[PDB]
Design a protein around this nucleic acid. Structure first.
Ligand SMILES: Cc1ccccc1NC(=O)[C@@H](Cc1ccccc1)NC(=O)c1ccc[se]1
Ligand SMILES: [Mg+2]
Ligand SMILES: [Zn+2]
Lengths: 620, 81, 62, 711, 23, 224, 48, 225
DNA sequence: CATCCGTGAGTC
């Protein structure tokens, strides 16, 4: 849904309403119907209420960096002049509410609306086409609200107590409806650990086989648990059929659940489910008590204590250079290290001195938003500032923002902040330019056939062998393996095959390979699969969006260029290296390569390096 | 097993995708039927031999697309490429 | 040459293509958007574009 | 937009212009802050856009020397002794010297406390240097800053980024119905309001002889009388309401240089760019999510955040080839109901109300004597009505525009009023709007903490304090530590202390925390004004101390603690919020980004002359642009028909747009798009470059494009 | 007091004594 | 494990009165007092000025020769005018004063069934040669009603609509004495606080607050 | 010239990745390869 | 226009739809009517129990499958209506192989067990089981520590007197005339096997009518429906 | 491997 203003809608459906005006004889012709709308007669507000019935509209927020920058919504009339948006699609448009404007486009032709409701509807495009990760997900206050009630608090009121003496077991409830009437009396805390008998939630996969033997759990079968009242309210959203979760909901955990639901459970389930999470987190981000005061933001106890240690370790370097024993390029390169170390010791000071009750840390440590580096800069010290050249300034900013920076401190920080935004203003242009270049080179690249059939693919290093023992998981797996489809049967040491060819790799199919001990699998690819015009569907494999085999006709070429250029604003090699590679330039470094394999003959000189190579197979 | 689909989410897109090759294919499938429905109504007034009328109960002021999408779900239409 | 001109170095694009007498088979993304043709992708391809939808024979007027 | 906005405009320093540099010619060196800018050009004031680093404000104490450089005052030091003798230094002159920081402690006589002091040096270098080697010192801690920069309380607590926006937004403030002075000040508020020239100052001393809303008269000591005339409801250059009103009562003894009557955004001769609002730092039911802002309905009912806006609509009568345009009350085929608000000339009557689409100045021009339709000729013989030769060309109210007509200024060539060649009557209608704040309006604090109005709940809904006082605004906690601008927090702490009043404990002596607190502040009244100068003012210690000094209400009960928080009741559920909520007072400005202006849409409308594409800009009722990047999103999706529709019938298909329109009002199906006229233009543009472009059918024959080739 | 020069309402000031030269 | 019919006491002050109500259910007090608070501040019927007219004034944005204030500020002053009227139908007030001298809410001429509860309210500072002939309309309504609504009825060009703040309530709060002692002696004691505008009484306000709620809670007792 | 067309494609893919890895940006190799493919769809003419 | 009252049903619970409420009265009625349903209706529940072969809690009752703990939980879920305010006492005894339910309970005069098919404790052979029950009357929920004196095997139980189990409410906005400001209150209410949800609302409704009586008596001035 | 002329450079 989206809140389309009444005054906006009346114009968008102008020839649509004038149609229904002369229809119901509020006007005798189309000419008077025009005057009726222009005069804004009270009747048309009732007609427009009918005209926009399930007639989807388009919301776009420039600059449009990837295809989710334009999404479809069901128009909802609303008093006022402001367009209303859903909290989840904020991650998509990169749209904040600091005065942002969005474009609105209304589809007309019978095909246009169809393409809107089907292809571009918000509740369908929940995963990013770039990574297959959830975008329409709990983001700020949402995650913070859920992180609250899912947190297990030790000595909180209403906690479970074992029996001893003349008093029985305290903290055991018959039903969730009982623990609810406990907190409402005030006996139970929504975050205190208790035992409850549940009747409408599937227990863990590890516990279900213990209490049922996988007999097939059923809406009525009771089972005892050891969690909190809050964590129980949470699973009523997932809801039934999905195994209970007994953890505190960090963003990564909330990220996992949606990702899992996106795989197994259908689209219209995930959409309505993540809806329930939005509503939940917001009600509980209100009663979470996350609040910033001058009190909450605290200056460290070892402030002047630690600083005086490194101010001292610095004056030892100032005097060691005063005797000319140190080079100038060395002196500062060391003073950087000294103060780099100093700032860290202040960061540690906070984390331990800061209670996890602390809303500033609560927001940070829950992945709701913000870095601890911001928190440090806020409560501890700013640290090092960047030279115009780019080097790190020898003198530091010992003051926190909470303490109030000195005059001369403000000046040099301001210099940095300005150059920061300037380079922030330039890189975007290089990103957008690179974006359009990538787009153009890959236009005749569409999914044309269902299968090329060539067994050609490429080696994927799924796992790394461990000298100590067992095995070590690779870091490149998710980006280089998970979305692929096998072009070769992955066989273990035995003659037993684990995964067929023509099979999409999923999460368990990896574990099936990961535990099998096979550390390399060949997979089909765009590079290897050969078709006439463009590529086939099989090799490309799973579209990161649909989570299934990509349809025939998907303009993957432009999709790809978007996925690369969109996040290109967050770099420092950096973005030049990216351009330098996509345009095939003879690189700056130009590190040589062995023309022929063989024995390396290092014969270094202080003036110049020379490397000779003896070809292993005879050779010169 | 889910909650009752509200608004433009009905009919549920997942069950709709089962009667079709892919997303894109569902579009032209639905829309060209919607074209037929709006043809039928306007033609009927003064023109015989119109396209086959709504194969389900047309809801009060139900969009031609919305009528079509439901009967796709009801497997009442035929699919040709 | 349509796709070419609408990218970069437009004035150079035309001169070369004019001498080479280069024809342009209007079959591409950029190529189609300019002329106003349905793009050769998505619902734009013939596989989905030319589709016949008919009521089932089992379905019949009351 | 406001006095400050104009003042800072005059002190702007731009590298752009003829003889200067273009924008594309500027590297990263020309833009960033240079050491020499200290005390000369502000490092904080500069636009966020692609203009950044090329536009800046001039520092407060700076002036220009007769050679074109920027000087700045420094105090003179003889030998470790700070003098009152002041000399202005250019940039390179300062380089050959050594300057001491302003806040370096000074003996009552004038000597330095420490031998080694913080020293500024050539090439941006800083070191500790013996007091004997100290040549000069800075005039003030707040020296390097601009005018706009100074009005930001606790600047030293906000990062240069949000401090930057905080400065820029202050120029974007809007004059309200009546202006409140900020509880928390910086001292700069006074001099700014005066120097702005948009308030009224007394030239020579005297006494108010007669006061009116219209004008103020002052009898002077020498016997002469001077009368200052008030600007009342004058339209600004940006559509805001420059309105001045008298301060002094009749017979008040006033002295030379005193503000006798301030203007827009000014209270008692001080910069009043907004209101003092009852803040609450808490996430509330998601309506403040991502920098969104919640408002008490009190601000609507009491016109607290309401402004006035004037528009100037103008039309003229010319000499054509069919006669001459005459402005009359007789417009072809218009009832006496639409003409109701007009006088006899045809002009709207003063004080009348205008809605959009209505008539302002009834003008008609003679139409070209072309043969009218044989389908309209027939229509005029049946009803026996003879067609006039005068086509309607009247000035109608533009979309969105409304309010009351507050003035009519008529110029007739008949009345010898000198017009440019060819014009007869020229009418200007001034319409005023009284815009109460609404959803989507951009509210901003002085700490670069912007945000649009998410929701305005009825007053009862508001998370209120124990004594039943509903808060005014509910900021979002999340977007505070992220921004590095916790000065807004300190403005709230000090703000609350300013509203309640306070009193330090003097029993057992004046406490150690308030040992640096000047005598005048150890006692403060309810609703009292204070100053927190930049790089001086309140310290975190004194602040926390004053939080405990907070005086109770009329009900003898304290409301907030020493943390700065208080307990709230959820106006919806009634249950008290589980955790203490930080509450206080913050100064809030209403920026000039209002939904009334920004909202815009289009069905059909005008079209380009050449490209036959829709025009642009809200002024011309143009539609939005579906650009190259927006097209990629379509192509990526796979919605070919949607995209095609957007760049044909929605755009430049001459015969297409017309036909689609009819198909909709007839309730038929949307037809098949044709050839974009943009393309036809291109092919005729190419052919004009000796480029024999031909469109070929499948056979190989060159086909026509609604046109033929003939020699 | 801060700017005790024109005839302005008294705005008290947390400050070190600033008497070099008025704005 | 106890039963007692609840009471309704009172601790008074002229403009504001504390309503103590006890005994009440546990955790019931907070959401009970607020139920009244939201009712008072919103829908308690009162009276105020709807529109005005001034001799020689055609619209809101101007000045009258001799008056220190402009029309806007004068209208802005009349927002705080505390009126109570018995006439359910609209009525017309009058104010005139000439020459020097300050004008207040006391120079108003309230007709039958209309009273001005605060005469010492500053309206304007009439200077020498200043003359002000005003005309004010008061009606009965509730809550908050915007000015802009009066204009489109067909109101003559002389009339200038003004915002109507009918709700004669000022500030309402409450506190709760919940006995949580481990026994059958656990209960809640409510203390509501109500302050009026001297238009009606703190008690009379809570009485029209109770007349509304009962008429609403009665539809939950009728059978289907 | 040394390692052949397929290998130089695998180098680009990862070296490009190695840049986005640094700033904590995750793009699936699939998208990279699409562009890389269009880079190599041509061959030069040694002998006519 | 006056307000309506609607219902979408289920056997044990139902959804009540209240509209149209004046803009800002959905929440005014919300948290107040809920806290009434969960706290202001009298009934009967178990205060304390006694088991024969129990000297301490940890050991399970000789001959019973369930633990001492889990039987308490089943017993809390027992729905009973006593006719007298004063605490009554019922006994339940059964031995041998099988399962003991709520139909085996021996109730006093004017005391009824409303779910005779409720599972309690699975007895095996040579499984003896004798339990005494203390049934009181009251409202809402009462902790166990407050029933620790009601001494040869007395166990304090969580008393759930209230005949309404769990209630939730949401407030949406309906569009009357041109105004889209009006409120709509949907209420979900689940009651025990004792009283109908349609009944428990009328009782809670009438109950609150009494409270707002104390105020209205003072003048009865003005209101319109 | 380094100069000289011509052509690029986020959106609303
Ligand atoms: C070194 C430098 C580069 C760019 C801009 C300014 C500066 N210098 C400073 O910011 C000096 C103050 C100064 C300004 C102008 C002339 C001389 C000195 N201050 C600092 O480098 C620091 C001051 C305190 C901690 Se770092
Ligand atoms: Mg923004
Ligand atoms: Zn392939």
């Amino acid at each position: 849904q989206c809140g389309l203003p009444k005054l906006m809608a009346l114009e968008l459906f102008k020839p649509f309403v004038m149609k229904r005006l002369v229809d119901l004889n509020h006007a005798q012709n189309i000419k008077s119907a025009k005057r009726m709308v222009e005069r804004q007669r009270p009747q048309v507000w009732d007609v427009l209420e009918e005209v926009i019935a399930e007639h989807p509209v388009l919301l776009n927020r420039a600059p449009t960096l990837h295809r989710l920058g334009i999404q479809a919504f069901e128009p909802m009339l609303v008093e006022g002049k402001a367009i209303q948006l859903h909290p989840l699609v904020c991650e998509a448009f990169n749209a904040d509410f600091d005065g942002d404007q969005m474009a609105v486009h209304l589809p007309l032709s019978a095909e246009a609306q169809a393409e809107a409701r089907i292809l571009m509807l918000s509740s369908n495009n929940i995963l990013s086409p770039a990574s297959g990760r959830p975008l329409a997900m709990p983001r700020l206050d949402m995650v913070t609200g859920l992180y609250y009630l899912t947190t297990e608090v030790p000595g909180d009121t209403g906690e479970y107590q074992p029996a001893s003496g003349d008093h029985p077991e305290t903290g055991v409830y018959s039903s969730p409806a009982e623990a609810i009437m406990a907190a409402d009396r005030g006996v139970l805390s929504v975050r205190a650990k208790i035992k409850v008998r549940l009747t409408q939630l599937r227990p863990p996969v590890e516990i279900e086989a213990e209490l049922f033997g996988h007999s097939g759990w059923q809406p009525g079968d009771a089972w005892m648990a050891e969690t909190t009242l809050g964590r129980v309210m949470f699973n009523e959203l997932l809801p039934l059929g999905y195994p209970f979760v007994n953890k505190q909901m960090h963003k990564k955990v909330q990220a996992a659940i949606i990702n899992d639901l996106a795989e197994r459970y259908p689209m219209i389930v995930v959409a309505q489910t993540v809806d329930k999470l939005k509503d939940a987190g917001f009600y509980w981000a209100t009663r979470s008590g996350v609040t910033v005061s001058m009190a909450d933001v605290l200056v460290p106890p070892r402030k002047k204590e630690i600083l005086d240690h490194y101010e001292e370790r610095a004056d030892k370097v100032e005097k060691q250079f005063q005797r000319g024993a140190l080079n100038h390029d060395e002196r500062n390169e060391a003073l950087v290290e000294i103060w780099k170390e100093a700032t860290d010791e202040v960061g540690q000071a906070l984390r331990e001195h800061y209670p996890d009750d602390n809303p500033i840390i609560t927001i940070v440590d829950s992945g709701a938003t913000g870095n601890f580096t911001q928190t440090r800069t806020l409560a501890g010290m700013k640290g090092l500032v960047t030279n115009p050249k780019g080097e790190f300034i020898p003198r530091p900013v010992k003051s926190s923002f909470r303490e109030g920076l000195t005059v001369l401190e403000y000046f040099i920080n301001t210099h940095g902040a300005r150059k920061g935004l300037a380079d922030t203003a330039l890189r975007t242009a290089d990103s957008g330019y690179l974006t359009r270049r990538l787009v153009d080179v890959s236009q005749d690249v569409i999914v044309r056939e269902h299968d090329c059939q060539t067994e050609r693919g490429i080696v994927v290093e799924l796992a790394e062998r461990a000298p100590d023992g067992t095995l070590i998981r690779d870091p490149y797996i998710e980006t280089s393996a998970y979305a692929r489809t096998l072009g070769t049967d992955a066989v273990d040491e035995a003659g037993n095959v684990i995964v067929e060819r023509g099979q999409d790799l999923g999460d368990p199919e990896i574990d099936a390979l990961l535990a099998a001990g096979i550390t390399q699998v060949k997979v089909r690819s765009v590079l290897t699969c050969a078709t006439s015009t463009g590529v086939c569907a099989t090799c490309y494999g799973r579209s990161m969006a649909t989570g299934k085999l990509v349809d025939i006709g998907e303009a993957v070429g432009i999709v790809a260029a978007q996925s690369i250029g969109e996040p290109g604003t967050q770099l420092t090699g950096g973005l030049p290296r990216v351009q330098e590679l996509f345009e095939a330039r003879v690189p700056r470094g130009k590190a040589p390569i062995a023309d022929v394999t063989g024995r390396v003959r290092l014969e270094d000189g202080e003036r110049f390096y020379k490397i000779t190579i003896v070809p292993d197979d005879g050779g010169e | 097993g889910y909650d009752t689909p509200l608004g433009i989410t009905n009919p549920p897109i997942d069950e709709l995708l089962d009667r079709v090759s892919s997303k894109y294919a569902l579009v032209i499938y639905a829309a060209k039927r919607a074209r037929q429905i709006n043809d039928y109504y306007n033609q009927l007034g003064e023109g015989i031999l119109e396209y086959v009328g709504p194969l389900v109960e047309p809801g009060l002021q139900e969009k031609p697309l919305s009528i079509a999408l439901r009967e796709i779900h009801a497997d009442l239409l035929e699919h040709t490429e | 040459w349509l796709s070419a001109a609408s990218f970069q170095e437009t004035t150079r694009v035309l001169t070369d293509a004019a001498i080479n007498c280069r024809s342009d088979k209007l079959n591409g993304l950029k190529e189609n958007v300019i002329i106003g043709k349905l793009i050769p992708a998505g619902t734009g391809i013939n596989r989905y574009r030319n589709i016949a939808v008919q009521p089932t024979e089992e379905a019949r007027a009351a | 937009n406001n006095p400050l906005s104009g003042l800072t405009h005059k002190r702007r320093l731009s590298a752009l212009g003829p003889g200067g540099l273009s924008r594309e010619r500027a590297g990263l060196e020309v833009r960033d802050v240079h050491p020499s800018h200290y005390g000369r050009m502000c490092p904080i004031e500069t636009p966020e856009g692609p203009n950044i680093g090329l536009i800046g404000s001039l520092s407060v104490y700076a002036r220009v020397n007769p050679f074109g450089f920027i000087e700045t005052p420094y105090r003179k030091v003889v030998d470790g002794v700070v003098s009152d003798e002041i000399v202005y230094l250019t940039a390179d002159e300062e380089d050959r010297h050594v300057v001491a920081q302003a806040n370096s402690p000074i003996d009552a006589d004038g000597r330095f406390v420490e031998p080694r002091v913080l020293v500024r040096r050539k090439a941006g270098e800083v070191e500790y240097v013996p007091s004997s080697e100290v040549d000069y010192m800075d005039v003030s801690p707040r020296q390097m800053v601009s005018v706009a920069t100074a009005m930001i309380p606790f600047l030293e607590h906000d990062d240069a980024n949000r401090a930057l926006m905080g400065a820029n937004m202050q120029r974007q403030a809007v004059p309200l119905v009546r202006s409140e002075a900020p509880l928390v000040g910086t001292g700069m508020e006074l001099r700014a309001a005066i120097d702005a020239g948009d308030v009224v100052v007394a030239e020579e001393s005297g006494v108010i002889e007669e006061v009116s809303a219209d004008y103020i008269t002052v009898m002077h000591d020498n016997g002469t009388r001077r009368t200052y005339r008030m600007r009342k409801f004058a339209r600004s250059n940006h559509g805001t309401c420059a309105n001045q009103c008298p301060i002094v009562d009749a017979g008040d003894r006033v002295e030379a240089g005193q503000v006798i009557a301030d203007g827009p955004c000014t209270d008692d001769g001080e910069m009043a760019l907004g209101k003092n609002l009852l803040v609450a730092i808490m996430p509330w039911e998601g309506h403040n999510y991502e920098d969104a802002i919640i408002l008490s309905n009190r601000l609507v009912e009491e016109d607290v955040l309401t402004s006035i806006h004037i528009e100037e609509h103008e039309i003229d009568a010319r000499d054509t080839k069919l006669g001459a345009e005459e402005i009359t009350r007789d417009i072809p085929n218009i009832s006496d109901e639409v003409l109701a608000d007009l006088d006899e000339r045809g002009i709207v009557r003063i004080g009348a109300e205008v809605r959009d689409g209505d008539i302002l100045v009834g003008k008609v021009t003679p139409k070209g004597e072309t043969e009218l339709t044989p389908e309209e000729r027939l229509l005029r013989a049946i009803f026996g009505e003879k067609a006039r030769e005068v086509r309607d060309t009247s000035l109608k109210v533009p979309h969105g525009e409304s309010g009351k007509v507050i003035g009519i200024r008529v110029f007739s060539r008949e009345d010898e009023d000198e017009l440019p060649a060819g014009v007869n009557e020229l009418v200007r209608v001034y319409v005023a709007q009284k815009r109460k704040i609404s959803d989507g309006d951009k509210l901003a604090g002085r700490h670069g903490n912007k945000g649009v109005i998410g929701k305005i709940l009825p007053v009862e809904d508001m998370p209120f304090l124990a004594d039943g006082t509903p808060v005014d605004i509910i900021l979002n906690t999340h977007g505070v530590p992220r921004r590095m601008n916790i000065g807004q927090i300190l403005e709230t702490h000090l703000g609350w202390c300013a509203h309640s009043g306070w009193k330090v404990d003097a029993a057992k002596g004046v406490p150690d925390w308030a040992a640096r607190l000047p005598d005048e502040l150890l006692e403060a009244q309810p609703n009292a004004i204070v100053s927190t100068p930049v790089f001086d003012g309140a310290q975190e210690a004194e602040l926390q101390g004053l939080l405990s000094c907070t005086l109770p209400n009329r009900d003898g009960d304290v409301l907030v603690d020493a943390d700065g928080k208080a307990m709230l009741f959820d106006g919806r559920s009634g249950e008290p919020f589980p955790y203490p909520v930080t509450v206080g007072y913050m100064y809030i400005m209403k920026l000039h980004h209002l939904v009334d202006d920004k909202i815009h849409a289009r069905s059909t409308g005008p079209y380009s002359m050449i490209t036959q594409q829709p025009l642009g800009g809200k002024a011309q009722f143009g539609g939005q642009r579906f650009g190259e990047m927006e097209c990629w999103a379509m192509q990526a999706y796979g919605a070919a028909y949607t995209l095609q529709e957007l760049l044909t019938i929605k755009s430049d298909d001459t015969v297409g747009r017309v036909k689609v329109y009819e198909a909709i009002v007839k309730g038929e199906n949307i037809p098949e798009p044709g050839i974009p006229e943009s393309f036809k233009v291109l092919l005729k543009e190419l052919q004009s470059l000796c480029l024999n472009v031909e469109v070929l059918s499948s056979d190989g024959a060159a086909i026509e494009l609604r046109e033929g080739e003939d020699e | 007091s801060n700017n005790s020069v024109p005839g302005a309402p008294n705005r008290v000031s947390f400050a070190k004594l600033r008497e070099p030269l008025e704005v | 494990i106890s039963q007692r019919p609840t009471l309704s006491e009172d601790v008074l002050t002229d403009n504001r009165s504390q309503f103590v109500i006890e005994p009440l259910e546990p955790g019931f007090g907070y959401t009970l007092g607020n139920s009244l608070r939201r009712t008072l501040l919103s829908s308690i019927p009162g009276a105020a000025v709807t529109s005005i007219r001034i001799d020689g004034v055609l619209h809101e944005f101007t000045t009258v020769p001799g008056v220190k204030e402009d029309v806007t500020e004068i209208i802005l002053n009349l927002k705080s005018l505390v009126v109570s009227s018995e006439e359910d139908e609209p009525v017309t007030m009058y104010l005139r004063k000439q020459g020097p001298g300050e004008v207040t809410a006391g120079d108003i001429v309230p007709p039958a069934g209309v009273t001005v509860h605060n005469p010492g309210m500053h309206i304007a500072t009439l200077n020498d040669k200043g003359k002000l002939e005003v005309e004010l309309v008061v009606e009965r309504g509730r809550g908050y009603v915007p000015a802009v609504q009066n204009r489109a009825s067909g109101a003559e060009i002389g009339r200038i609509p003004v915002d109507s703040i009918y709700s004669p309530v000022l500030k309402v709060t409450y506190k709760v004495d919940a006995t949580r002692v481990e026994q059958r002696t656990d209960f809640d004691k409510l203390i509501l606080d109500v302050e009026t505008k001297n238009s009606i009484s703190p008690r009379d306000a809570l009485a029209s607050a109770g007349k509304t709620l009962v008429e609403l809670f009665g539809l939950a007792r009728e059978l289907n | 010239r040394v390692q052949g067309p397929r290998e130089v494609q695998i180098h680009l893919v990862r070296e490009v990745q190695e840049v986005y890895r640094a700033q904590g940006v995750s793009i699936h190799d699939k998208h990279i390869e699409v562009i890389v493919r269009q880079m190599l769809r041509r061959v030069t003419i040694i002998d006519s």
